[PDB]
Write a structure and sequence with these properties.
Chain B: Its main location: membrane. The complex is a heterotrimer. Chain A contains no helices and 9 strands. Chain A is mainly beta. The chains are: A mainly beta, B alpha+beta, C little secondary structure. At the A-B interface, strand 1, strand 2, strand 6 and strand 7 of A face strand 1, strand 2, strand 3, strand 5 and strand 14 of B. The complex binds sodium ion (NA). The site of sodium ion has 2 residues of chain A, from strand 1.
Amino acid sequence: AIQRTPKIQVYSRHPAENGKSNFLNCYVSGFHPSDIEVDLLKNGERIEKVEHSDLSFSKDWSFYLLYYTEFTPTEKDEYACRVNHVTLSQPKIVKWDRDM
Amino acid sequence: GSHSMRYFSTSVSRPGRGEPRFIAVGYVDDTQFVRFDSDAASPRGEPRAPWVEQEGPEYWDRETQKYKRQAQTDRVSLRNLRGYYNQSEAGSHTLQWMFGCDLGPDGRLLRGYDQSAYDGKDYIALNEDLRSWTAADTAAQITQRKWEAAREAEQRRAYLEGTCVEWLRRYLENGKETLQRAEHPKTHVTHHPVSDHEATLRCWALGFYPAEITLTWQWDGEDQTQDTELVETRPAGDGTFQKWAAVVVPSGEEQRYTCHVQHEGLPEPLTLRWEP
Amino acid sequence: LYNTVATL
Ligand code: NA
C-alpha cells in the first residue's frame, strides 16, 4: 500500500498575543495510511484533552486532520506538535513559530 | 453561484484486531456538516454544522442507518478486493470513496462525481457522464463487469442528479447566512532578517472563506515565482482558512516587492507591501 | 444526505 509521511503545520487560530485566549493548532496532511497519533506539547509535556477534526482526505486520496486546544500564549511558554506515523522511525516534533 | 455537496468515506481493515473501521464525513462547499465513525463509543450520524441540527430525529436515524449499511458494504468490498489481488490475510488495507454533486455558476446542476481508491491508488470511477466506469486495472474490471450487469451507474446517477441536488439546495437555504456569504481574507506582511544581505517577506491571508485563494509576489510589477514559498492552505478551526506566501529578497530591496491576493470575497485583486 | 451503494 501507499506510504506517505505527514506534512505538519503548527500555528494559532488567531494572531498570537500574550495574555489573550486563542487556539493552538497542529494540521497534519498528505499522509497515508490514515492511522496517526498527534500530541500538542507545552514546555515539552503532553497537553491533555486535545481535540481533533474528523478524518477526511484530499483529491489525491491523502488524509488530513486538525488537532487543536484552547490556550493563552505567554512570553515564555513553548509549544510544539509531536506526530507519530508508520512512515516515521521516531515521533517527529515541530516547534510552534508565531509567524508561521 | 457554484456549490457542492461532497462525501468522503474511509474503511480500514486490521486483520487479527477486529473488523474494519469505517469513517464518513460530509461537506457543503468547505463546511463540514456530518460525521460517522464505526469505532465511536456509540456510532451514529452526528451533526457538525448548526444548519443540520434541526432536521429532526427521523432524518438522523435514517442517516445513521445508511452509514451502518455502507460500513457493512465496505467490509464485504475489502474482502472481495483481497481476493481479486490474491493478497494475504495478514495485511491491513484501505478503501476510500468520494462522491458529490456540483451546482454550476448559475446555481443549476452541473455535474456529479463518484470515485474509489484501494490502498491509496485509483480503483474505479464513474465517468463524467455518470453512465459508464473507468477501471484502473484488471481487478477493478471485475467490479465494472458486476456494476454493468447490475445497472449500478443508473442508481448512482439518480442520486447525484436528483436527491443530492435537492438536499444540497435545502442545506444551502438553511445555512444561507454562512454558506452563501464569502469572507474576505484579512492580510498583513511580516519581515525577517536572514543575513547581512537577505531578508524574508511573508504575505499573510487569515480568516477567509471559502478556502480557494491565490497569493503571489511581484517585483516591480513582475510575477516572482523562483524564490517564493507557499504553504498549504490550512483550516483555522473556526470554519475559516489561512495561507501565507514568503519570498526571499535582497536586504534593502523590500519596497520593490508587492503581494497580490485573489479571493472570491475581494471585489478586485488586492496589492500589499511591507509597512515597517 | 448520504447515499449507500453496491459492493465492489
Ligand atoms: Na504546507
